[PDB]
């Protein structure tokens, strides 16, 4: 994930922005300068482009079974090919247990040394989400979510929320609620020989507050806010025992009225980070934490569209496949004694980067939301080749299996090799949006129709619409040729001229429309075919980006006529008559970014924290690390090729 | 058998599905994409296929004693063969323990006329089926179970059910009755040496509740549901005694009516599995457990037939040979000690795998059911000469041996090495299915004669019909040549064209018809006989599989006249006419299954889990492992050789 | 550990100091000469430095059972691992002693469910602390013990004490109470074979009074003084039995009140040590005794801080993991016979050394305390990058493992191979000290704000402060480069001079400031921040050590502006100004400690004794010695490698 965020060490460094939101949303401001090269002279314009991101969401969880992983075991027990040496783990118990006779191995295999279902990624989800919520809490920004009330005088949209924004809590209370629901049974089991088949976790190097936090968050999660991360989650395990030298019972007392909320307020974000770092470093959970970060980032937030038709993508809900929690590392103290067993290098470097800066996960999530939303429309277009490909040889099979859905979308949008989940049966997916013809309905209020194909008072949207500017992944290089996405392009003459002298293919017509809307001239396009009532290219005043109209996507018509270019009231840099001969000049448009920052409303400016590849140096002290990986465990990167996109290892 | 289930998926993504039932049935949805590449114009079509299954069955059980197996004792008590070194036992009694010479001499004189009959296969059968029933009950769907009600709108067929679901129980009742049926005369044994030739059990490592469950489940088992694994079975031993530290009294009060039902509930599935694990790994019953697992898998369930005529497969009832219960492990306490001798490697690894994941047995049962049906059907088909040039004596070659019946069926189906029972005189058989003229009078209530072989108010079939489709096991190489059963097939030019259309061979015509029905074209055909009421390639929806046309089941029909190729009501991919010599093209297809997730009924969806075989190495400590097998015991595999399927060693 | 204490003085003049206390504290005077050689003009100054210590502490003890160690029995009763050859035990019972076959068979049947948990570490802990307390009492200075009352004339700080000295006892009272607390149910055992799984002790070689002391000291131990080694501890075993020739009755009358206090006095220190020696060398408990000695040393005492902020180090309380008491040596009389097996060489030599001189433990405790504090502080410092070019992950590298916590601290401090505990799941830890932001609210009563980080009426610290000075262990090579911690350092030219003075690096400035404060010049400095109330290099008298200036604890500060070099009130050696480029000279210093003699308070002076290691060879007769160690048991050493400190074998 770190390599993708840093765009392969571009300028040797990268950047990230802190998590922050107001009423469940936050703008993402920018400043850009767009040049103009014609008449062997330069014009330019500077304009502040914004972008709206919302944290609201209602994903659906599935705490199903998942494959067990034993990577954080000593080298002497695990093997690259032999794996778990059951004889080696068993006979070590005999040398240390007080159980007599030769039936020691039989009893141990009967009771506890048969399951081998070590997997804590659900717990890592819980704790990392808790850290993010606590950040939003003490930053004075924790509240119920609220999708913005989109309004332009024309058709307007409003989506409902589970809980009221004002009725939402102003402080982060506990996930579970005391004296309402059951809690898992826990007890410090420090015996050398396990007695009952039950998940075991080693939290010896954790302080009392950290172990209290972990064992309390072990219980059921209850949603109290509309945020996409407050998803419902039951208690991960019905029963478990924690390997701690000291006995901790503050949570147990708080179950009864013994401890009030005052004396059991949730801890601080640095306390959560210390607990998580201690836990991961102790149990050698680098790959599992990397997978946890991937999963949480993929559900962090969605980009609020600036167009009326964009809300169709926003209204959707995702499905998460979190494996059932199971922990077998406290069953035997000697398991952790020794170097870690084949920890993935990408996981290690990513873990070190997150420890250096805990904001990398949020910045990656912010990038990935925009990247996925763009990549869905991008693959829908690229499958048909603007309706100019006969067969279906684009080979979009990487979008079929729900595991690689998001990663394939990322590899489609940007040429960067999207990072694999590093696990199996775990994913976030919108199955209804699998095929490129994704019809959907939008609930719509009562406004007068102005060429917006309103059907049954419900905006009918086909597929997925591009709903966010690419300004945070600007070098996207989505199309093969030059475009606003690439950043620098040159407007060319019309293909031919006729009685209104405007013959342009959809792609360069959209290029010219975006250039003119940047320059302050709205453009009128007219095709006598299917139009649905749009005569000018759709754009937003706050965000000068011009969304590609549907007729470019449908691939039926290949030409669009731009009859007259009108001048907006908010005039800007003057241009000649482009849509006429003997006056058009080969203008070229380039843009660069001036200032990028993330602000919640207009208050408490959050200066960006620079991150470079200097601290990327992993801690290799007693951690057997392998850079290579296997596709079986989904350790690779989906890469876009000439014919399409496929999954390959990084080599 | 783990090797078989892994090679079914060629060691890539070895899927397995949780047990789940809805009224005794369920359905396994898939998502398979089929290609159509011709003239470098690659097309494809994805579609969901649902091959449903039913757990309802009424097998016939014959409890006949067979060979006595003693391959779990220490080496020093066993000779070079299975012969028990009884003289060694008495010498060890003389040497190790200090017993009066008169006492040991009297015991040795008494033992000279004792039966060393030890077979716990029936006990393992009962315990495993009880565990599965408890799993199904705690899942909340256990009931009497009913055969599916299938109708095509032209014929309505409903097989009678012995016990209806409405009157069926909802909670798992005990196999026996409350003092209504006599219980076995169990007793407590704790001395060093046996006193009566009655078999004795070693159940010391088990807990009080597990011993209660085993002892009272030893009683006569009554069939209370139409479940296939709910076969009737008598008390496995009229008298016995368990070697335990203390006597167990809880079950006796319930037996005699002192304890009511609520005071004695059925134990959990987890504790049942723990008891089974303890018993097997304590008596070292790995081989007998492997045989019992094979029997359960082969007797688990049958596939619901999509077509009408396939219900004949549901009509037939299996016959089994369960050896009588015998136990000499509890006769002496030293026998189970030492290093276990004569343990098969395949049995050990299979036992480790099934205890690591208790769903391997169920997925192997599903695979064996579908493979059995396909193997029998394609055996009948290849008897004609369809697809196979060599007219091998498939009728009576190796299908006579009941122990090798199902394994030979699997060999004929897939070509993979079917795992043998590993035990003598134990098998599952359908005696009325060896003949190739097996007809059945399936009761029908015809709505209208859509065209079938309906005779005497209830139609008949020939041999074995088709009930399933090769989708749980797709890459099955039933035929040597390319076919839909294989991954991909290349449609070739017609043998001869003519004015009305073209004629086709036995296999090529069916292959093209299946490809066209997948594409969306319904294919008509004309045959020299008039033996049916429809000139169509029947292909029921839900799986889009075109059954082998019944006309080719008989011989002397090598050419089939195919005409009238046209689109159906719905259409997926445009294809050339393929019958006229002008429009014909060398269409090549390719099929691959991507996703599969069984779901019980219409609410409970059970996502496909996964198995990490790297972590499931067997517990090889303290075990004398033997890779080789003995053909008289049927410790081997059967492979479909080009010269005829036969039993071979794994070497 | 003897190797460690000898290498601290590089095997030359291995000093050691008698235990001595004054109100729970004492002070270790020294006489160290510091050189100043420049331009062949060698100067020097001798001065007495006093680094005082306190024995007062309140550690937290968690009595949790851990791994069972059996490495003291004869070879024939032990397998290749720690597994007890119980079958060998029963065969030897059969062969050697003439016991009825029925009796031995019954005993063998009973023994099958017995716990071979044997760990006498808690017992050795208790006996050693009792011996030390009796030594301190007979020395005539035992009391409740009070924390020192330190004030600089500007802030008055006094840590609260649980038990004041005035009400504190003057004579060593018994750990238990006169029938107020229940005593363990001891008994007399003399038969050949055990009868109950309750642990049994072999105390035959001990005398009647020693057995009385051990048996009644087995009871619950109450904390009656604020001594660090006076931790509360419950009864180590509710029931037990001692293998002795005759029963012991003297203690019982005192237990039941029949015997009054004067009739039963605490036994002498000499007889306590004799009893400990007999017990250890009879049960062959060398490894467990070495572990217990390590624990006592690591938990003995803390250094009184000269500076005000160092009292935060005294605020923190340790946490320990003492394994539960277990004894199987007394189960059978033959076990202790034969040749002892699995005895570590280091443990044997350390045991011989500590019994030759019972002060080695105390001097090693003092050294481990000072090394611990210095290691933690310089770890926090080197996290910034002070002195060390490589920014190794010192935060969480190997400090997570509690068993390796203090050893890693010692490795970071000195670079010498720290001796491991030699036992699993036993450690001393400060959980609130792993984090680098550990703050404490030390209660202060400010007389006047002389300039400190005083906030909220009670100042705070960051991480771990400094309380001691590297004078008990002078040649400590904490930093790779030359420094005051090393023997000598060469002051080099300034990086850049300027009109007001010169600027200096992070390390060179502190080195020069320390050298100048030793010389007699007070050095001022200016920093880009304003984070303190004094621009001075703080150096309290009594030790003439200049603490690391707190400004450099944080990062992003590489250059420090130093000016105003001038003589203090008193002066020792004339030095050039060293800041102006003209007066600057290449001053080179050299430091060496000559004399040291701890003295308790102001009256009792304990001259430094000596140890002749030539006469302290271990008793290797009748012992199977093993030089190698097993990393799971933590039988090794940790060395500060250039690539990061880690656990290595001694080979």
Author numbering:
A (entry chain B), B (entry chain A), C (entry chain A): 1 to 651
Passage from the reporting paper:
After SEC, we vitrified fractions 5 and 6 that include megadalton (MDa) assemblies (orange dotted line). In the acquired cryo-EM micrographs, large unperturbed complexes are visible, including fatty acid synthase (FAS)44 and polysomes as well as prominent circular signatures. To first explore this signature, we collected 7011 movies at a pixel size of 1.57 Å and performed image analysis of the derived spherical signatures, resulting in an icosahedrally averaged cryo-EM map at 3.77 Å resolution (FSC = 0.143) in which an initial backbone trace could be built. Simultaneously, we used ModelAngelo47, an automatic model-building tool, in its de novo mode, enabling us to construct an atomic model within the EM density. The patches generated in this process were then compared against the “non-redundant protein sequence (nr)” database, a task executed using the blastp suite. Compared to other studies, we succeeded in (a) mildly reducing sample complexity and rapidly retrieving L-A virus in yeast cell extracts directly amenable for cryo-EM; (b) identifying unambiguously the L-A virus using the high-resolution features of the calculated cryo-EM map by Cα-trace model building in a supervised and unsupervised manner; and (c) probing the environment and components of the L-A virus by quantitative mass spectrometry.
S. cerevisiae, a genetically well-described system, harbors in its genome an endogenous virus known as L-A virus, a member of the Totivirus family, and its discovery was the main starting point of research on yeast virology. The L-A virus contains a single 4.6 kb double-stranded RNA (dsRNA), encoding for a capsid protein (Gag), and the viral RNA-dependent RNA polymerase fusion protein (Gag/Pol).
